[PDB]
Amino acid sequence: EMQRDLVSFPLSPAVRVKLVSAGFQTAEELLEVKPSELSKEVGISKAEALETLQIIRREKKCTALELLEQEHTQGFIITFCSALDDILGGGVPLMKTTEICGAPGVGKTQLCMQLAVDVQIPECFGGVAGEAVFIDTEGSFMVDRVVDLATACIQHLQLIAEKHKGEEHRKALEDFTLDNILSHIYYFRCRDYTELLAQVYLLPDFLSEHSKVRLVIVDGIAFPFRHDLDDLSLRTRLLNGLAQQMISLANNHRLAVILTNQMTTLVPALGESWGHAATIRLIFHWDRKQRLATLYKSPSQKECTVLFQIKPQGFRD
């Protein structure tokens, strides 16, 4: 019969020390222990006894086939660029962490606004019909640009709907108006990295309240850490923790987590270990005054560089 060590459970360090000093090495020896008996023997308080009993007695197994069906039903956030959609497997994937690395002024924030617009696209139009959460740390989230992108997306959906000749498309676009799009983008302004960490901690509760959010964007994860943080070890710890928080949020709440990152001197910033954080990595870079998107790391598509551009209509090929 298996034995689960208390060091494995998220018990209080002081409570774990007192429980093993009392002699509880494995949690199996506490399931039948009453909370009053536990507190009288170990010496921890009543609340601590109740909490540790809850924790020890607390401890989804979806097969890869069910995961594939989820991936098919949970549509990718279409990027409106055919090349990136092809090399991202249909767009920015849900339940994944994408990292848009690049030099300043290459089009990372334009992509973030485009995705925030494209999440509200209805399901019958290939979208996910969800809200977007924007976490802007660089102070570059321009509302006029996202309004223009929303207008262009609405026109594109109108064109494809009236090419389809379908009443369901018209009904689904009826609530897909500019006011709804701008009311479906929950924007946070994290002034510094402690604000960002606090907002990432509050994101699970916010999304439990807002159950229809499908995208979370961190417009600049390099900015709050490369500035006002002179400790490299602390930066590494905070980045690892925040990366785990973002991936956990994306998978638990069926999201896509975009993370914009700056370039350092060529190579993505925030250390080489941070390259292990995001599931997908897209470097946006300039070649002869023309924009190329490179799929540096992706667990589903081969590395390949494609052509894209920014137009008044938004994020095009």
Binding site: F9, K60, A64, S248, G275, H276
Partner: protein
């Protein structure tokens, strides 16, 4: 552990109360303390205490298995689970080994996730054995597994069956991962139906890194408890554990080494270090950075484009 009713036959409540009152709380205190003096100052029978100690050591201690019996049982119960990659199989001498922790060390985009996905696809389809993929960094995409299975075979029913064999579990901090591994240990205990044969944990370093750093050593303890869970899964439960680990440069020698430090460097029985070619994207150099049955440092070339 502590003394409780039903822990072992022959004990009673008043015995436990007397032992507690005589500064004996646990099994280690019961068996380390002198039986004669506790018997004479406690009122309990000496023979009863001797029998209690004997059954306690019979139950809580690990019997020494003979070398020949162990050898003949692992000559059948072990398995060289082929990775599905010819060159990586030749580097590992035909591939994984059931009963070991295998660590696929590498940098970002080094192929550890792809190696583990090909491993899971080949085990689920080639050997028709269930796989557990403990996704921690989001690397596992069922579309990539489907692509690998389509490369392996073009029968839709076979691909669907192989995908259903691969069981995906998401665990993003150390406590979720430990809960997942302990739940798997309980599941295998109940099962001993197609049981899980490969446990891919991609990546251990993703969930262990937040623990490390600062003035706390419970991060090291949680890392070592994760190591104990992985090694009990590997050896005691007889299934191939393939963890993936990041790679870091030591700030004293400028040499690449597995992450999570010296304490974790001893954890994987086998370790494959994947790195990129200094002079194609698909091609990667695979080194046997650590092994127990093969010379260290052998270089092979693995081309991810050849499968998929």
């Amino acid at each position: 552990g502590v003394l409780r009713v039903g822990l072992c036959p022959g004990l009673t409540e008043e015995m436990i109360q007397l032992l507690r009152s005589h500064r004996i709380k646990t099994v280690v205190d019961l068996v380390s303390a002198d039986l004669e003096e506790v018997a004479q100052k406690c009122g309990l029978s000496y023979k009863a205490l001797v029998a209690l100690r004997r059954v306690l050591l019979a139950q809580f201690s690990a019997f020494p298995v003979n070398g020949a019996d162990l050898y003949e049982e692992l000559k059948t119960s072990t398995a060289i689970l082929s990775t599905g990659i010819g060159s990586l199989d030749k580097l590992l001498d035909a591939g994984l080994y059931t009963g070991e922790v295998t660590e696929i060390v590498g940098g970002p985009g080094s192929g550890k996730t792809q190696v583990c996905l090909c491993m899971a696809a080949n085990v689920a389809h080639g050997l028709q054995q269930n796989v557990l993929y403990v996704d921690s960094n989001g690397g596992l995409t069922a579309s990539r597994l489907l692509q690998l299975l389509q490369a392996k075979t073009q029968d839709e029913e076979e691909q669907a069956e192989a995908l259903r064999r691969i069981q995906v579990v998401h665990a993003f901090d150390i406590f979720q991962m430990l809960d997942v591994l302990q739940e798997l240990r309980g599941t295998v205990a109940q099962q001993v139906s197609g049981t899980v044969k490969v446990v891919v944990v991609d990546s251990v370093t993703a969930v262990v890194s937040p623990l490390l750093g600062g003035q706390q050593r419970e991060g090291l303890a949680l890392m070592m408890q994760l190591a104990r869970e992985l090694k009990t899964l590997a050896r005691d439960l007889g299934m191939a554990v393939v963890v993936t680990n990041h790679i870091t440069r030591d700030r004293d020698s400028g040499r690449l080494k597995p992450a999570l430090g010296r304490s974790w460097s001893f954890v994987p029985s086998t370790r494959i270090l994947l790195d990129t070619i200094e002079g194609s994207g698909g091609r990667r150099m695979a080194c046997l950075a650590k092994s127990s049955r093969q010379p260290t440092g052998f270089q092979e070339m693995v081309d991810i484009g050849t499968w998929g």
